[PDB]
Coordinates of C-alpha atoms and ligand atoms in Angstrom, one line a residue:
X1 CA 2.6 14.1 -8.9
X2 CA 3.6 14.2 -5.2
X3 CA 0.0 14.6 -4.2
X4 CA -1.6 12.6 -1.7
X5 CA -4.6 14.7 -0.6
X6 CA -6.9 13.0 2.3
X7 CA -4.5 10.0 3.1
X8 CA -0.5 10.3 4.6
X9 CA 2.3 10.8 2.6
X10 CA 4.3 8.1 3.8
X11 CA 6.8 8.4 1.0
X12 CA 10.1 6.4 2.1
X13 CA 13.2 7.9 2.0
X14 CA 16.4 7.1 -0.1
X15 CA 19.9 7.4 1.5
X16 CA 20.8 10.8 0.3
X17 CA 18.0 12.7 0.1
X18 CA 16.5 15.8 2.4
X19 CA 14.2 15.3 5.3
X20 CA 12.9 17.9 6.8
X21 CA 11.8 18.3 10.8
X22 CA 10.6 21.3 12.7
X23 CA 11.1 21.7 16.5
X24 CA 8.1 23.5 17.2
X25 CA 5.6 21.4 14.7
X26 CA 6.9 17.9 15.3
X27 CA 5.5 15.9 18.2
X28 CA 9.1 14.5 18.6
X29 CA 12.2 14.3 16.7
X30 CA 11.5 11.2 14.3
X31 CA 8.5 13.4 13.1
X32 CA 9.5 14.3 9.6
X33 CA 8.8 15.9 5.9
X34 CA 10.2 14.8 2.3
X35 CA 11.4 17.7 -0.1
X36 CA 8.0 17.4 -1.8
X37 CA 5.8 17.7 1.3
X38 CA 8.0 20.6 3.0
X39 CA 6.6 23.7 3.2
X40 CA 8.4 26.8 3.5
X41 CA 5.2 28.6 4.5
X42 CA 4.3 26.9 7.3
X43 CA 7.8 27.4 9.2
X44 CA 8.4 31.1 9.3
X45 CA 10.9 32.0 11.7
X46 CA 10.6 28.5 13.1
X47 CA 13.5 25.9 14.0
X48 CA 13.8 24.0 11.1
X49 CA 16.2 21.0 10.9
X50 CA 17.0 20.0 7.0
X51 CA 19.1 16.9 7.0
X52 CA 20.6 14.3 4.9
X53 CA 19.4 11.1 4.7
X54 CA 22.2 8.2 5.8
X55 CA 21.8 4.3 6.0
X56 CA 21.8 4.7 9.4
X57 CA 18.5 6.7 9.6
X58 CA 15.9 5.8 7.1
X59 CA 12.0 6.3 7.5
X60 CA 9.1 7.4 6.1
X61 CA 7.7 11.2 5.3
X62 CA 4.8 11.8 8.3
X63 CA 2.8 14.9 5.8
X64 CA -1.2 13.9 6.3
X65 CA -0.9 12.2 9.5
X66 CA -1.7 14.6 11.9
X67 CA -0.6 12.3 15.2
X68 CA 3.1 13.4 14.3
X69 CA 2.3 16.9 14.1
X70 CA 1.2 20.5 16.8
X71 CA 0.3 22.2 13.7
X72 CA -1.8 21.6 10.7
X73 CA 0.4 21.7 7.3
X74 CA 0.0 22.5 4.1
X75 CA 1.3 20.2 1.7
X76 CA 3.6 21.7 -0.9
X77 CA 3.0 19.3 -3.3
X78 CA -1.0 20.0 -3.0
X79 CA 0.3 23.9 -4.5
Ligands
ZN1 ZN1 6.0 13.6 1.9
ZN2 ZN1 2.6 16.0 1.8
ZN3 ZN1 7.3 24.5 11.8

């Protein structure tokens, strides 16, 4: 399971898959979520940017490290 309770995510994205940012929660705009992390909860009403991963951008899911974030999250994969 997608879990990673007390440590960051860090999960590495594939070309292709969803990546998830929030204008309000993010520090700045390379702060990001993975599919499994994403919570729909924690973004009500908020601007939420869902993307497709290219080969251009590529990077790493920033869920447990709370330097890249204003608010705290809730993991979806810890539901
Ligand atoms: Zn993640
Ligand atoms: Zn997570
Ligand atoms: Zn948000």
């Amino acid at each position: 399971v997608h879990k990673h309770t007390g440590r960051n995510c860090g999960r590495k994205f594939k070309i292709g898959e969803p990546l998830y940012r929030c204008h309000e929660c993010g520090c700045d705009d390379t702060c990001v979520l993975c599919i499994h992390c994403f919570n729909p909860k924690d973004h009500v009403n908020h601007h939420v940017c869902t993307d497709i991963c290219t080969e251009f951008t590529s990077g790493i899911c920033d869920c447990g490290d709370e330097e890249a974030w204003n608010s705290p999250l809730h993991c979806k994969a810890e539901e």
